[PDB]
Design a protein around this ligand. Structure first.
Ligand SMILES: [Zn+2]
Length: 159
């Protein structure tokens, strides 16, 4: 496993709309390697999620991996999920606000309003369709990472 360089706020890579992963990439060693490098990078930076644009890869891949760590001492622990081509199909009208940081925003945290619940459809790295309901802090990570795929940093969502 390799720890990749992470783009910081102000770099233009972080402002693009990341391109969807194509059919021939699904279940490829390319794609497995991409996800493994993202995963190592996130762990090394005590992230609870990561998006491919953050590691200069303008593709629609994210990792959602809520776990307590120094950066988030109170996060619930889930098994890390890698999502290819995620699409949020439903946001709840109910809001929750929480403090977010970001691997791409050194030394700034802010309060962000997010949907309490999201329903997300995505593909596994093999290419199989999955739909999952997330609540609370995992939901906020899903929203944060999808924002990265759409060129949005959490600083822009500060109410
Ligand atoms: Zn981030």
């Amino acid at each position: 496993s390799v720890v990749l360089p992470v783009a910081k706020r102000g770099e233009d890579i972080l402002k693009l709309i990341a391109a969807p992963v194509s059919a021939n990439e699904l279940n490829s060693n390319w794609l497995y390697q991409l996800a493994d490098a993202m995963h190592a990078t996130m762990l090394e930076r005590n992230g609870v999620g990561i998006a491919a644009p953050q590691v200069y890869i303008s593709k629609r891949v994210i990792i959602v991996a809520s776990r307590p760590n120094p950066r988030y001492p109170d996060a619930p622990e889930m098994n890390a999920v890698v999502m290819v081509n995620p699409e949020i199909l439903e946001f709840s009208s109910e809001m929750c606000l929480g403090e977010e940081g970001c691997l791409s925003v050194p030394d700034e945290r802010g309060q962000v309003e997010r949907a309490e619940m999201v329903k997300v459809k995505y593909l596994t790295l093999q290419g199989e369709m999955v739909e999952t309901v997330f609540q609370g802090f995992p939901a906020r990570i899903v929203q944060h990472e999808v924002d990265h795929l759409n060129g949005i940093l959490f600083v822009e969502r500060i109410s």
